[PDB]
């Protein structure tokens, strides 16, 4: 059976920070697209 | 991931440039100085091919084309949109190919073996350099080399061939084709023989070296041997590459008529 050696506490910690980082990245993406739509609308 | 037996062979040393700074693995790959170089140049070349497709008329995979300069540029430097992009990419390509060969040399030194594979790769590299460097220099212009595009380098091959009316009668071309054909035949026979000896008729034991010799002596009357067929293989492939390079360095620089007219030296010998 495949395991990673992380306990459940370590996995919870990693998950917290992973989700925060992904949310911040997607926020920046949305902002870039709002600027691009204001400048050069494509649809 | 490592194989069952891999860990005891992953030691340090054996390098050419760099030293202990680039001596690591990333996954299964070994990196080194030349690994960094190769990936750098491959990435840059690929991205420039893609950009040259972006400024063209289509992004269809079959119809992309980046062309060399005109013949009036000579051996100079062409504008970016009319040939200079081709020159930058053809510098990246050389960098990547040579890096590949030297990385191979580092790996073989670490594992304790001979340098036969990078040496055989050198002849492919030599054929490429003949087509992009040596022949253009002898004829006096970069615009004698081929464009980068599937389907578009084939138009080059076709028209260059018909610049001599019938390119089949080129002598070094005949010799190279002979080697190519014989190489495919030999590879089929070698593959078949080893498979046949370790996968015998149902309910039999694995056969031996005596069986390998006997079968070909029965069919044909001569058997070359288990170590000499590997030699014969290296030989046929290298010779194919070599005579291709010769046949292209002959066409244009040393012969400008039709290729059938060269052969005329034979029936004009004063001995029949």
């Amino acid at each position: 059976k495949p395991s990673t050696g992380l306990t459940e506490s370590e996995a919870k910690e990693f998950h917290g920070l992973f989700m925060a980082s992904m949310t911040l990245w997607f926020g920046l993406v949305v902002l870039a697209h709002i600027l691009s739509w204001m400048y050069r609308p494509w649809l | 991931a490592l194989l069952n037996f891999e860990k005891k062979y992953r030691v340090r040393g054996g390098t050419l440039v760099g030293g202990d700074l680039f001596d690591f693995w990333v996954g299964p790959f070994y990196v080194g100085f030349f690994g960094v170089s190769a990936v750098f140049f491959a990435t840059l070349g690929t991205m420039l091919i893609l950009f040259g497709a972006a400024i063209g008329p289509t992004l269809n995979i079959w119809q992309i084309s980046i062309a060399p300069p005109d013949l009036s540029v000579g051996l100079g430097f062409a504008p970016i949109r009319e040939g200079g992009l081709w020159q930058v990419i053809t510098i990246c390509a050389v960098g990547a190919f040579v890096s590949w060969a030297l990385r191979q040399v580092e790996i073989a030194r670490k594992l304790g073996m001979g340098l036969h594979v990078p040496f055989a790769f050198s002849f492919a590299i030599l054929a490429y350099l003949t087509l992009v460097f040596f022949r253009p220099v002898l004829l006096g212009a970069w615009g004698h080399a081929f464009p980068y595009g599937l389907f578009s380098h084939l138009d080059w091959v076709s028209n260059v061939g018909y610049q001599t009316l019938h390119f089949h009668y080129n002598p070094a071309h005949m010799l190279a084709i002979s080697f190519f054909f014989i190489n495919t035949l030999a590879l089929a026979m070698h593959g078949s023989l080893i498979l046949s000896v370790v996968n015998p008729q149902k309910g039999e034991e694995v056969k031996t070296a005596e069986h390998e010799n006997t079968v070909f002596r029965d069919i044909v009357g001569y058997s070359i041997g288990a170590l000499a067929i590997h030699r014969l293989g290296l030989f046929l492939a290298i010779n194919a590459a070599f005579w291709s390079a010769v046949c292209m360095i002959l066409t244009g620089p040393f012969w400008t008529r039709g290729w059938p007219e060269w052969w005329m030296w034979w029936p004009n010998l004063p001995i029949w």
Partner: protein, 72 residues
């Protein structure tokens, strides 16, 4: 027809979950790229259709560019 899919979870006793996850993710990305490229190569293409306006043509007819092309 209410109890016929009961033991379905025992799928994971013969298929490795991690391998399956990786396979699914890779297949989905490949299919995403493929369908986008198939639709971009048809009449439904949305980057080159010049809607809501053509931008290269818009740049060719700016008054400054027109006046510079005139004096030539």
């Amino acid at each position: 027809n209410a109890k016929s899919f009961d033991g379905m979870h025992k799928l994971w006793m013969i298929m490795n979950p991690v391998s399956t996850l990786w396979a699914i993710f890779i297949f989905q990305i490949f299919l995403g790229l493929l369908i986008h490229m198939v639709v971009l190569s048809s009449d439904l293409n949305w980057h080159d259709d010049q809607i809501p306006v053509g931008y290269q043509l818009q740049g060719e007819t700016l008054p400054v560019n027109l006046e510079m092309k005139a004096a030539q």
